[PDB]
């Protein structure tokens with residue numbers, strides 16, 4: 138169950154995710170998964186990033202879950218669970234701003 142995952146923050150808003158992620162102590166890739174504010178059954182992967190152009194900033198990625206079972210950000214790259222998706226993106230940056238590193242502090 139994802140509700141049991143420590144990186145699953147459930148029902149928190151995009152602004153709240155940004156307040157949490159915009160902590161100067163967070164290295165690139167700090168993250169959390171939350172419910173989408175707009176899409177029933179969809180999730181959002183909120184990730185911290187940092188560069189010399191934007192400084193500390195946050196990106197939000199939509200994660201889809203098909204009735205058919207798969208979870209994905211891009212339909213070309215799917216997973217059997219949200220957990221496997223997180224594990225994969227903790228090792229490959231692919232199209233994300235940074236690979237996922239550690240769970241966001243409260």
Ligand SMILES: CC(=O)N[C@@H](Cc1ccc(CC(=O)O)c(C(=O)O)c1)C(=O)N[C@H]1CCCCN(Cc2ccc(-c3ccccc3)cc2)C1=O
Nearest residue numbers: 151172173174175176181196197198199210211231232233
């Ligand atoms: C207003 C906003 O922040 N929208 C987000 C998408 C979004 C996220 C959460 C909610 C919901 C909410 O905030 O509650 C909604 C919404 O529904 O309104 C919309 C966005 O544009 N992120 C960017 C994030 C930075 C990359 C660019 N991109 C397109 C893209 C390109 C490639 C990939 C990719 C990733 C991994 C591997 C391969 C490709 C992913 C996205 C995005 O979607």
